[PDB]
Tab-separated table of C-alpha atoms and ligand atoms in Angstrom:
chain	number	residue	atom	x	y	z
A	200	UNK	CA	-83.085	-32.607	-59.006
A	201	UNK	CA	-84.317	-32.512	-55.393
A	202	UNK	CA	-84.758	-28.800	-54.601
A	203	UNK	CA	-85.831	-27.259	-57.934
A	204	UNK	CA	-88.207	-29.743	-59.579
A	205	UNK	CA	-88.951	-32.170	-56.735
A	206	UNK	CA	-89.841	-29.404	-54.264
A	207	UNK	CA	-87.772	-30.314	-51.204
A	208	UNK	CA	-87.384	-27.210	-48.985
A	209	UNK	CA	-83.913	-25.630	-49.122
A	210	UNK	CA	-83.651	-25.604	-45.321
A	211	UNK	CA	-84.075	-29.373	-44.952
A	212	UNK	CA	-81.579	-30.130	-47.733
A	213	UNK	CA	-78.773	-28.392	-45.808
A	214	UNK	CA	-79.759	-29.909	-42.446
A	215	UNK	CA	-77.844	-33.133	-43.170
A	216	UNK	CA	-74.906	-31.331	-44.834
A	217	UNK	CA	-73.774	-29.012	-42.030
A	218	UNK	CA	-70.111	-30.186	-42.110
A	219	UNK	CA	-69.898	-29.465	-45.843
A	220	UNK	CA	-71.019	-25.868	-45.287
A	221	UNK	CA	-68.686	-25.368	-42.322
A	222	UNK	CA	-65.694	-26.810	-44.180
A	223	UNK	CA	-66.296	-24.477	-47.128
A	224	UNK	CA	-66.550	-21.425	-44.850
A	225	UNK	CA	-63.397	-22.208	-42.858
A	226	UNK	CA	-61.345	-22.280	-46.067
A	227	UNK	CA	-61.888	-18.562	-46.757
A	228	UNK	CA	-62.530	-17.507	-43.134
A	229	UNK	CA	-58.930	-17.979	-41.927
A	230	UNK	CA	-56.040	-15.530	-42.260
A	231	UNK	CA	-52.259	-15.762	-41.970
A	232	UNK	CA	-50.527	-14.327	-38.916
A	233	UNK	CA	-48.676	-11.014	-38.696
A	234	UNK	CA	-45.160	-10.927	-40.115
A	235	UNK	CA	-42.599	-8.349	-41.200
A	236	UNK	CA	-43.518	-7.776	-44.849
A	237	UNK	CA	-41.092	-5.036	-45.923
A	238	UNK	CA	-38.085	-7.002	-44.640
A	239	UNK	CA	-38.890	-9.887	-46.992
A	240	UNK	CA	-39.193	-7.434	-49.903
A	241	UNK	CA	-35.851	-7.410	-51.733
A	242	UNK	CA	-35.526	-4.962	-54.659
A	243	UNK	CA	-33.173	-7.308	-56.542
A	248	UNK	CA	-29.899	0.083	-63.802
A	249	UNK	CA	-33.360	-1.398	-63.217
B	99	UNK	CA	-22.102	-59.759	-19.706
B	100	UNK	CA	-23.199	-58.854	-23.232
B	101	UNK	CA	-25.982	-61.448	-23.143
B	102	UNK	CA	-26.862	-60.412	-19.586
B	103	UNK	CA	-27.078	-56.772	-20.697
B	104	UNK	CA	-29.735	-57.675	-23.269
B	105	UNK	CA	-31.774	-59.658	-20.733
B	106	UNK	CA	-31.787	-56.862	-18.148
B	107	UNK	CA	-32.775	-54.450	-20.921
B	108	UNK	CA	-35.650	-56.800	-21.752
B	109	UNK	CA	-36.547	-56.932	-18.055
B	110	UNK	CA	-36.531	-53.128	-17.913
B	111	UNK	CA	-38.778	-53.029	-20.983
B	112	UNK	CA	-41.053	-55.598	-19.339
B	113	UNK	CA	-41.165	-53.386	-16.232
B	114	UNK	CA	-43.307	-50.811	-18.036
B	115	UNK	CA	-45.507	-53.681	-19.266
B	116	UNK	CA	-45.917	-55.259	-15.814
B	117	UNK	CA	-48.435	-52.633	-14.626
B	118	UNK	CA	-51.355	-53.549	-16.892
B	119	UNK	CA	-54.563	-52.510	-15.145
B	120	UNK	CA	-57.938	-52.770	-16.929
B	121	UNK	CA	-58.159	-49.040	-17.589
B	122	UNK	CA	-61.390	-47.794	-19.148
B	123	UNK	CA	-60.564	-46.967	-22.775
B	124	UNK	CA	-62.786	-45.273	-25.331
B	125	UNK	CA	-63.110	-47.779	-28.158
B	126	UNK	CA	-65.274	-45.414	-30.229
B	127	UNK	CA	-62.961	-42.567	-31.245
B	128	UNK	CA	-62.916	-39.513	-33.500
B	129	UNK	CA	-59.389	-38.597	-34.590
B	130	UNK	CA	-58.117	-35.584	-36.531
B	131	UNK	CA	-54.660	-36.007	-38.076
B	132	UNK	CA	-52.920	-32.627	-38.370
B	133	UNK	CA	-49.777	-32.955	-40.489
B	134	UNK	CA	-47.244	-30.166	-40.976
B	135	UNK	CA	-46.337	-29.110	-44.533
B	136	UNK	CA	-44.121	-26.039	-44.169
B	137	UNK	CA	-40.649	-24.808	-45.061
B	138	UNK	CA	-39.346	-26.444	-41.879
B	139	UNK	CA	-40.316	-29.839	-43.344
B	140	UNK	CA	-37.897	-29.493	-46.284
B	141	UNK	CA	-34.915	-30.470	-44.115
B	142	UNK	CA	-32.975	-33.685	-44.752
B	143	UNK	CA	-32.762	-34.962	-41.161
B	144	UNK	CA	-35.185	-37.758	-42.121
B	145	UNK	CA	-34.242	-39.431	-45.387
B	146	UNK	CA	-35.281	-38.448	-47.986
B	147	UNK	CA	-37.051	-35.549	-46.265
B	148	UNK	CA	-39.433	-34.910	-43.390
B	149	UNK	CA	-42.441	-34.460	-45.681
B	150	UNK	CA	-41.921	-37.763	-47.502
B	151	UNK	CA	-41.283	-39.899	-44.419
B	152	UNK	CA	-44.175	-38.416	-42.433
B	153	UNK	CA	-46.646	-39.051	-45.259
B	154	UNK	CA	-45.389	-42.617	-45.716
B	155	UNK	CA	-45.798	-43.363	-42.009
B	156	UNK	CA	-49.155	-41.567	-42.032
B	157	UNK	CA	-50.441	-44.003	-44.665
B	158	UNK	CA	-49.227	-46.924	-42.555
B	159	UNK	CA	-50.788	-45.312	-39.479
B	160	UNK	CA	-54.101	-44.980	-41.335
B	161	UNK	CA	-54.014	-48.682	-42.217
B	162	UNK	CA	-53.227	-49.730	-38.644
B	163	UNK	CA	-55.664	-47.243	-37.099
B	164	UNK	CA	-58.730	-48.614	-38.896
B	165	UNK	CA	-57.589	-52.241	-38.569
B	166	UNK	CA	-57.558	-52.049	-34.755
B	167	UNK	CA	-60.300	-49.381	-34.439
B	168	UNK	CA	-62.879	-50.371	-37.071
B	169	UNK	CA	-65.747	-48.331	-35.576
B	170	UNK	CA	-63.749	-45.096	-35.316
B	171	UNK	CA	-63.503	-42.057	-37.580
B	172	UNK	CA	-60.515	-40.081	-38.826
B	173	UNK	CA	-59.837	-36.773	-40.524
B	174	UNK	CA	-56.687	-35.273	-42.012
B	175	UNK	CA	-55.552	-31.636	-42.005
B	176	UNK	CA	-52.385	-30.041	-43.376
B	177	UNK	CA	-50.734	-26.763	-42.371
B	178	UNK	CA	-49.685	-24.901	-45.524
B	179	UNK	CA	-48.879	-21.228	-46.139
B	180	UNK	CA	-49.937	-20.294	-42.618
B	181	UNK	CA	-53.427	-21.716	-43.225
B	182	UNK	CA	-55.136	-25.009	-42.404
B	183	UNK	CA	-56.200	-26.998	-45.473
B	184	UNK	CA	-58.739	-29.811	-45.167
B	185	UNK	CA	-57.916	-32.908	-47.227
B	186	UNK	CA	-60.328	-35.478	-45.752
B	187	UNK	CA	-63.609	-35.226	-43.854
B	188	UNK	CA	-64.346	-37.290	-40.761
B	189	UNK	CA	-65.296	-40.696	-42.153
B	190	UNK	CA	-64.877	-44.394	-41.444
B	191	UNK	CA	-63.567	-45.299	-44.906
B	192	UNK	CA	-59.815	-46.062	-44.725
B	193	UNK	CA	-59.436	-45.741	-48.515
B	194	UNK	CA	-60.571	-42.112	-48.766
B	195	UNK	CA	-57.938	-40.980	-46.258
B	196	UNK	CA	-55.174	-42.970	-47.964
B	197	UNK	CA	-56.139	-41.463	-51.322
B	198	UNK	CA	-55.903	-37.938	-49.899
B	199	UNK	CA	-52.488	-38.650	-48.375
B	200	UNK	CA	-51.117	-39.930	-51.692
B	201	UNK	CA	-52.192	-36.735	-53.465
B	202	UNK	CA	-50.479	-34.625	-50.794
B	203	UNK	CA	-47.235	-36.527	-51.417
B	204	UNK	CA	-46.716	-34.611	-54.684
B	205	UNK	CA	-47.127	-30.989	-53.587
B	206	UNK	CA	-44.007	-29.441	-52.072
B	207	UNK	CA	-44.360	-28.020	-48.536
B	208	UNK	CA	-43.888	-24.278	-48.159
B	209	UNK	CA	-44.888	-21.403	-45.918
B	210	UNK	CA	-45.205	-21.156	-42.160
B	211	UNK	CA	-47.293	-23.359	-39.850
B	212	UNK	CA	-50.229	-22.245	-37.714
B	213	UNK	CA	-51.376	-24.455	-34.844
B	214	UNK	CA	-54.305	-22.148	-34.068
B	215	UNK	CA	-55.712	-22.415	-37.593
B	216	UNK	CA	-55.356	-26.205	-37.559
B	217	UNK	CA	-56.809	-26.473	-34.050
B	218	UNK	CA	-59.701	-24.164	-34.939
B	219	UNK	CA	-60.468	-26.325	-37.978
B	220	UNK	CA	-60.254	-29.431	-35.785
B	221	UNK	CA	-62.702	-27.872	-33.321
B	222	UNK	CA	-65.199	-27.565	-36.175
B	223	UNK	CA	-64.774	-31.010	-37.707
B	224	UNK	CA	-65.253	-32.602	-34.269
B	225	UNK	CA	-68.277	-30.457	-33.342
B	226	UNK	CA	-70.788	-32.875	-35.011
B	227	UNK	CA	-69.419	-35.846	-33.044
B	228	UNK	CA	-71.601	-37.783	-30.559
B	229	UNK	CA	-70.934	-37.443	-26.848
B	230	UNK	CA	-69.872	-41.104	-26.546
B	231	UNK	CA	-66.921	-40.679	-28.931
B	232	UNK	CA	-63.531	-39.427	-27.748
B	233	UNK	CA	-62.546	-36.323	-29.713
B	234	UNK	CA	-58.797	-36.494	-30.345
B	235	UNK	CA	-56.263	-34.575	-32.435
B	236	UNK	CA	-52.883	-36.067	-33.387
B	237	UNK	CA	-50.642	-33.185	-34.484
B	238	UNK	CA	-47.333	-33.977	-36.193
B	239	UNK	CA	-45.398	-30.744	-35.646
B	240	UNK	CA	-42.072	-30.157	-37.362
B	241	UNK	CA	-41.379	-26.452	-36.934
B	242	UNK	CA	-39.900	-24.613	-33.955
B	243	UNK	CA	-42.142	-21.562	-34.445
B	244	UNK	CA	-45.842	-20.824	-34.868
B	245	UNK	CA	-47.346	-17.833	-36.686
B	246	UNK	CA	-50.998	-17.326	-35.760
B	247	UNK	CA	-53.532	-14.526	-36.357
B	248	UNK	CA	-55.061	-14.662	-32.868
B	249	UNK	CA	-54.440	-15.718	-29.268
B	250	UNK	CA	-53.481	-19.390	-29.077
B	251	UNK	CA	-54.313	-19.429	-25.357
B	252	UNK	CA	-57.993	-18.758	-26.079
B	253	UNK	CA	-58.140	-21.714	-28.475
B	254	UNK	CA	-56.496	-23.994	-25.899
B	255	UNK	CA	-59.175	-23.035	-23.378
B	256	UNK	CA	-61.855	-23.694	-26.002
B	257	UNK	CA	-60.460	-27.168	-26.701
B	258	UNK	CA	-60.605	-28.061	-23.000
B	259	UNK	CA	-64.225	-26.886	-22.854
B	260	UNK	CA	-65.174	-29.224	-25.725
B	261	UNK	CA	-63.412	-32.237	-24.147
B	262	UNK	CA	-60.994	-32.526	-27.073
B	263	UNK	CA	-57.655	-34.291	-26.601
B	264	UNK	CA	-54.392	-33.408	-28.345
B	265	UNK	CA	-51.258	-35.447	-29.043
B	266	UNK	CA	-48.263	-33.605	-30.508
B	267	UNK	CA	-45.302	-35.310	-32.193
B	268	UNK	CA	-42.493	-32.785	-32.567
B	269	UNK	CA	-39.366	-33.147	-34.672
B	270	UNK	CA	-36.514	-30.935	-33.422
B	271	UNK	CA	-37.061	-29.942	-29.773
B	272	UNK	CA	-39.668	-28.945	-27.201
B	273	UNK	CA	-41.955	-25.969	-27.822
B	274	UNK	CA	-43.565	-24.190	-24.885
B	275	UNK	CA	-47.011	-23.769	-26.449
B	276	UNK	CA	-47.185	-27.410	-27.549
B	277	UNK	CA	-46.352	-28.575	-24.021
B	278	UNK	CA	-49.096	-26.357	-22.594
B	279	UNK	CA	-51.529	-27.462	-25.307
B	280	UNK	CA	-50.934	-31.128	-24.472
B	281	UNK	CA	-50.817	-30.577	-20.692
B	282	UNK	CA	-53.829	-28.290	-20.215
B	283	UNK	CA	-55.794	-30.593	-22.550
B	284	UNK	CA	-54.876	-34.010	-21.080
B	285	UNK	CA	-55.805	-33.210	-17.450
B	286	UNK	CA	-52.261	-32.230	-16.473
B	287	UNK	CA	-50.473	-35.263	-17.912
B	288	UNK	CA	-47.171	-34.438	-19.616
B	289	UNK	CA	-46.640	-37.772	-21.419
B	290	UNK	CA	-48.574	-36.731	-24.553
B	291	UNK	CA	-45.744	-34.644	-26.076
B	292	UNK	CA	-43.247	-36.932	-27.816
B	293	UNK	CA	-40.070	-35.879	-29.639
B	294	UNK	CA	-38.494	-38.525	-31.852
B	295	UNK	CA	-34.760	-39.179	-31.700
B	296	UNK	CA	-34.456	-41.198	-34.937
B	297	UNK	CA	-36.522	-42.814	-37.690
B	298	UNK	CA	-37.089	-46.029	-35.720
B	299	UNK	CA	-38.557	-44.107	-32.780
B	300	UNK	CA	-40.893	-42.324	-35.208
B	301	UNK	CA	-42.464	-45.605	-36.331
B	302	UNK	CA	-43.099	-46.574	-32.706
B	303	UNK	CA	-44.687	-43.193	-31.944
B	304	UNK	CA	-47.278	-43.554	-34.715
B	305	UNK	CA	-47.882	-47.182	-33.741
B	306	UNK	CA	-48.393	-46.184	-30.101
B	307	UNK	CA	-51.099	-43.660	-31.033
B	308	UNK	CA	-53.142	-46.433	-32.681
B	309	UNK	CA	-54.192	-47.817	-29.300
B	310	UNK	CA	-57.200	-46.161	-27.633
B	311	UNK	CA	-56.547	-43.453	-25.066
B	312	UNK	CA	-57.639	-44.307	-21.496
B	313	UNK	CA	-60.404	-42.045	-20.229
B	314	UNK	CA	-60.389	-39.972	-17.051
B	315	UNK	CA	-62.515	-40.941	-14.064
B	316	UNK	CA	-64.299	-37.570	-13.814
B	317	UNK	CA	-65.099	-37.560	-17.564
B	318	UNK	CA	-68.274	-39.661	-17.716
B	319	UNK	CA	-70.129	-40.024	-21.008
B	320	UNK	CA	-71.713	-43.434	-20.559
B	321	UNK	CA	-74.651	-44.200	-22.845
B	322	UNK	CA	-76.206	-46.793	-25.143
B	323	UNK	CA	-75.690	-46.446	-28.904
B	324	UNK	CA	-78.238	-47.869	-31.347
B	325	UNK	CA	-76.321	-50.261	-33.609
B	326	UNK	CA	-77.281	-52.710	-36.327
B	327	UNK	CA	-75.971	-56.031	-37.646
B	328	UNK	CA	-76.845	-56.423	-41.351
B	329	UNK	CA	-76.974	-59.675	-43.307
B	330	UNK	CA	-74.900	-60.042	-46.462
B	331	UNK	CA	-76.895	-60.832	-49.605
B	332	UNK	CA	-75.859	-62.422	-52.905
B	333	UNK	CA	-77.831	-61.024	-55.844
B	334	UNK	CA	-77.598	-62.274	-59.415
B	335	UNK	CA	-78.103	-58.840	-60.993
B	336	UNK	CA	-76.277	-55.607	-60.051
B	337	UNK	CA	-78.234	-53.085	-57.983
B	338	UNK	CA	-77.877	-49.413	-57.132
B	339	UNK	CA	-76.147	-48.728	-53.821
B	340	UNK	CA	-77.751	-46.307	-51.372
B	341	UNK	CA	-74.404	-44.653	-50.513
B	342	UNK	CA	-72.639	-44.039	-53.849
B	343	UNK	CA	-75.560	-44.512	-56.288
B	344	UNK	CA	-73.519	-46.920	-58.430
B	345	UNK	CA	-73.970	-50.496	-59.644
B	346	UNK	CA	-72.456	-53.064	-57.264
B	347	UNK	CA	-73.068	-56.806	-57.453
B	348	UNK	CA	-73.183	-57.278	-53.678
B	349	UNK	CA	-73.556	-55.322	-50.451
B	350	UNK	CA	-75.089	-55.531	-46.995
B	351	UNK	CA	-78.754	-54.879	-46.190
B	352	UNK	CA	-79.650	-52.560	-43.328
B	353	UNK	CA	-82.049	-54.106	-40.771
B	354	UNK	CA	-83.885	-50.795	-40.207
B	355	UNK	CA	-84.747	-49.577	-43.725
B	356	UNK	CA	-83.589	-52.419	-46.047
B	357	UNK	CA	-81.364	-49.958	-47.934
B	358	UNK	CA	-78.152	-51.580	-49.135
B	359	UNK	CA	-74.565	-50.479	-48.506
B	360	UNK	CA	-71.293	-51.347	-50.220
B	361	UNK	CA	-68.748	-51.637	-47.391
B	362	UNK	CA	-68.742	-51.785	-43.596
B	363	UNK	CA	-68.551	-50.391	-41.011
B	364	UNK	CA	-70.439	-47.269	-42.109
B	365	UNK	CA	-73.479	-45.324	-40.957
B	366	UNK	CA	-76.557	-46.056	-43.037
B	367	UNK	CA	-77.130	-43.210	-45.545
B	368	UNK	CA	-80.906	-43.396	-44.912
B	369	UNK	CA	-81.655	-43.985	-41.212
B	370	UNK	CA	-78.286	-42.701	-39.913
B	371	UNK	CA	-77.854	-45.977	-38.017
B	372	UNK	CA	-74.384	-47.430	-37.531
B	373	UNK	CA	-73.904	-50.771	-39.296
B	374	UNK	CA	-71.245	-53.155	-37.970
B	375	UNK	CA	-70.442	-56.864	-37.869
B	376	UNK	CA	-69.795	-58.995	-34.802
B	377	UNK	CA	-66.140	-59.211	-35.855
B	378	UNK	CA	-65.739	-55.424	-35.703
B	379	UNK	CA	-66.655	-55.435	-32.000
B	380	UNK	CA	-64.593	-58.549	-31.248
B	381	UNK	CA	-61.462	-56.752	-32.472
B	382	UNK	CA	-61.557	-54.501	-29.386
B	383	UNK	CA	-62.246	-57.072	-26.650
B	384	UNK	CA	-58.526	-57.274	-25.834
B	385	UNK	CA	-58.627	-53.580	-24.845
B	386	UNK	CA	-61.160	-54.306	-22.066
B	387	UNK	CA	-59.722	-57.555	-20.631
B	388	UNK	CA	-55.961	-57.232	-21.195
B	389	UNK	CA	-53.961	-60.400	-20.633
B	390	UNK	CA	-51.975	-60.270	-17.400
B	391	UNK	CA	-48.243	-60.027	-18.025
B	392	UNK	CA	-46.082	-63.135	-17.695
B	393	UNK	CA	-43.460	-63.145	-14.936
B	394	UNK	CA	-40.027	-64.684	-15.426
B	395	UNK	CA	-39.684	-67.841	-13.331
B	396	UNK	CA	-36.514	-67.993	-11.190
B	397	UNK	CA	-34.111	-70.851	-11.877
B	398	UNK	CA	-34.067	-71.825	-8.184
B	399	UNK	CA	-37.372	-73.705	-8.377
B	400	UNK	CA	-38.073	-76.801	-10.463
B	401	UNK	CA	-39.861	-76.719	-13.812
B	402	UNK	CA	-42.818	-78.700	-15.145
B	403	UNK	CA	-41.827	-79.690	-18.699
B	404	UNK	CA	-38.690	-79.419	-20.817
B	405	UNK	CA	-40.612	-78.054	-23.830
B	406	UNK	CA	-43.022	-75.191	-24.401
B	407	UNK	CA	-46.660	-75.788	-23.508
B	408	UNK	CA	-47.985	-74.084	-26.660
B	409	UNK	CA	-45.318	-74.459	-29.373
B	410	UNK	CA	-43.465	-77.555	-28.076
B	411	UNK	CA	-40.023	-75.942	-28.240
B	412	UNK	CA	-37.152	-77.362	-26.201
B	413	UNK	CA	-36.264	-74.777	-23.575
B	414	UNK	CA	-32.594	-73.788	-24.084
B	415	UNK	CA	-30.552	-75.088	-21.162
B	425	UNK	CA	-28.157	-69.578	-15.865
B	426	UNK	CA	-31.454	-67.808	-16.558
B	427	UNK	CA	-34.607	-69.884	-16.918
B	428	UNK	CA	-35.909	-69.569	-20.479
B	429	UNK	CA	-39.500	-69.985	-19.275
B	430	UNK	CA	-42.427	-67.617	-18.752
B	431	UNK	CA	-45.392	-68.684	-16.625
B	432	UNK	CA	-48.967	-67.422	-16.397
B	433	UNK	CA	-50.286	-67.067	-12.852
B	434	UNK	CA	-53.871	-67.858	-13.870
B	435	UNK	CA	-53.009	-71.317	-15.246
B	436	UNK	CA	-49.386	-71.826	-14.100
B	437	UNK	CA	-48.020	-73.077	-17.424
B	438	UNK	CA	-44.496	-72.396	-18.652
B	439	UNK	CA	-43.991	-70.665	-21.998
B	440	UNK	CA	-41.014	-70.043	-24.251
B	441	UNK	CA	-39.650	-66.579	-24.980
B	442	UNK	CA	-40.995	-66.666	-28.548
B	443	UNK	CA	-44.537	-67.549	-27.457
B	444	UNK	CA	-44.644	-64.757	-24.870
B	445	UNK	CA	-44.215	-62.135	-27.595
B	446	UNK	CA	-46.834	-63.698	-29.890
B	447	UNK	CA	-49.375	-64.308	-27.106
B	448	UNK	CA	-49.409	-60.665	-25.935
B	449	UNK	CA	-49.164	-58.901	-29.327
B	450	UNK	CA	-50.902	-60.996	-32.009
B	451	UNK	CA	-53.012	-63.299	-29.856
B	452	UNK	CA	-54.937	-62.016	-26.841
B	453	UNK	CA	-55.777	-65.243	-24.981
B	454	UNK	CA	-53.515	-67.488	-22.927
B	455	UNK	CA	-53.676	-71.032	-24.383
B	456	UNK	CA	-53.088	-72.543	-20.947
B	457	UNK	CA	-56.035	-70.698	-19.416
B	458	UNK	CA	-58.380	-71.828	-22.190
B	459	UNK	CA	-57.084	-75.408	-22.017
B	460	UNK	CA	-57.452	-75.532	-18.231
B	461	UNK	CA	-60.948	-76.786	-17.309
B	462	UNK	CA	-63.040	-75.118	-14.628
C	258	UNK	CA	-31.849	4.162	-60.632
C	259	UNK	CA	-35.158	2.890	-62.029
C	260	UNK	CA	-37.621	0.855	-59.949
C	261	UNK	CA	-40.035	-1.287	-61.976
C	262	UNK	CA	-42.848	-3.004	-60.064
C	263	UNK	CA	-44.889	-6.007	-61.207
C	264	UNK	CA	-48.164	-6.815	-59.448
C	265	UNK	CA	-48.836	-10.560	-59.694
C	266	UNK	CA	-52.533	-11.348	-60.064
C	267	UNK	CA	-53.920	-14.809	-59.343
C	268	UNK	CA	-54.335	-15.315	-63.090
C	269	UNK	CA	-50.749	-14.147	-63.636
C	270	UNK	CA	-49.509	-16.774	-61.169
C	271	UNK	CA	-51.268	-19.490	-63.182
C	272	UNK	CA	-49.675	-18.124	-66.356
C	273	UNK	CA	-46.256	-18.109	-64.681
C	274	UNK	CA	-46.667	-21.799	-63.848
C	275	UNK	CA	-47.604	-22.496	-67.472
C	276	UNK	CA	-44.576	-20.546	-68.708
C	277	UNK	CA	-42.331	-22.468	-66.309
C	278	UNK	CA	-43.668	-25.769	-67.657
C	279	UNK	CA	-43.139	-24.600	-71.242
C	280	UNK	CA	-39.634	-23.373	-70.402
C	281	UNK	CA	-38.798	-26.714	-68.779
C	282	UNK	CA	-40.113	-28.555	-71.840
C	283	UNK	CA	-38.034	-26.389	-74.182
C	284	UNK	CA	-34.863	-27.013	-72.170
C	285	UNK	CA	-35.579	-30.749	-71.986
C	286	UNK	CA	-35.902	-31.085	-75.767
C	287	UNK	CA	-32.609	-29.261	-76.339
C	288	UNK	CA	-30.889	-31.524	-73.793
C	289	UNK	CA	-32.023	-34.799	-75.390
C	290	UNK	CA	-29.058	-37.149	-75.812
C	291	UNK	CA	-28.045	-37.915	-79.432
C	292	UNK	CA	-28.972	-41.212	-81.079
C	293	UNK	CA	-25.468	-42.702	-81.002
C	294	UNK	CA	-25.298	-42.171	-77.220
C	295	UNK	CA	-28.762	-43.585	-76.460
C	296	UNK	CA	-28.006	-47.114	-77.703
D	501	ZN	ZN1	-72.077	-47.591	-52.710
D	502	ZN	ZN1	-80.695	-48.121	-42.693
D	503	ZN	ZN1	-43.328	-71.511	-27.206
D	504	ZN	ZN1	-52.633	-68.615	-18.533
């Protein structure tokens, strides 16, 4: 409603929503730490 | 000696409360609550389990935190599957945080914890915080190990650079990194790492964190903050709120742009001006002029009256069951002393005494 | 011996949760107490 038809610039719209952008990026920007992966693998005739 | 043992224990407890100096405390705060939800929290040491009890006390802590710090902000983070998950943004609404905590109560904790991921997320949430607010993180750690993708030491240095403060509440025993994180971040103090010894101690630890943290002398951030005191209005017809865009019968009116808000204290969604009431500021006056502790009066000297000055309770006839205030020199009963320094924050004798 | 591997895709994990819920429901219905024992 505000950026497509009204004409508000995209840059100004995100100026007041910096924390929203940062929170969304941190969700997919973090990784788990190293750990022995093959030790946890248990094969558990087939 | 059994009764004497209790009294000396009370005296020892009062000893820590005798040294009450008017320390400069940061009333405006910005807290990040990092809770641990990992495999280590599935133990049964805390009935029913660590996850359930911590969440329940967290909800109570949220209620107390905003009641005594109405102009502060809080955020909540959880450590799950080796990653930091955000469940509540920094905001002054106590209901949003409670709602997030209740939802977390259902999901089972699993995976490994990661202090670095939680701390890195905290560093980001606190980045858009004014310089007059105290950036604080209250981590509730439950594991004895930390799996991180990078160097935790680098993050600790970064936190010190941003003037962030960390409080860690462990569960089982001391952890070397947590001690360093709390020590290198609190200007060398080692009293910010607390390990509970039972459920009762846990309740006290959360309740202790509610009070504002005294600031350091070399950390100066003095300034003037532009605030506003709106006037409540009573409208016959519902009107659209400027914060949630819904129909609400009432709401406050901002004095800078006349835009209405639903609840206080919150920053105006139009002029970004903090809106508060005189009561919100009055709630924190007792943190700037703490009442001087009452000293037990020895039985050797004579007393003024047989009954309490405030509650008119007959003093029980060894030890004098009277507490006197040096400012006004009026005896008080043991019951009044507790209520005058915890619920009330003004000595009735001092107010009654003319000057 | 024979080694059979099963790669679990994100969609497969969602399906596994649905199957677990359906399996729990099926077991619950079979375990319903008879009428004479309810009242
Ligand atoms: Zn609203
Ligand atoms: Zn305004
Ligand atoms: Zn009394
Ligand atoms: Zn007094």
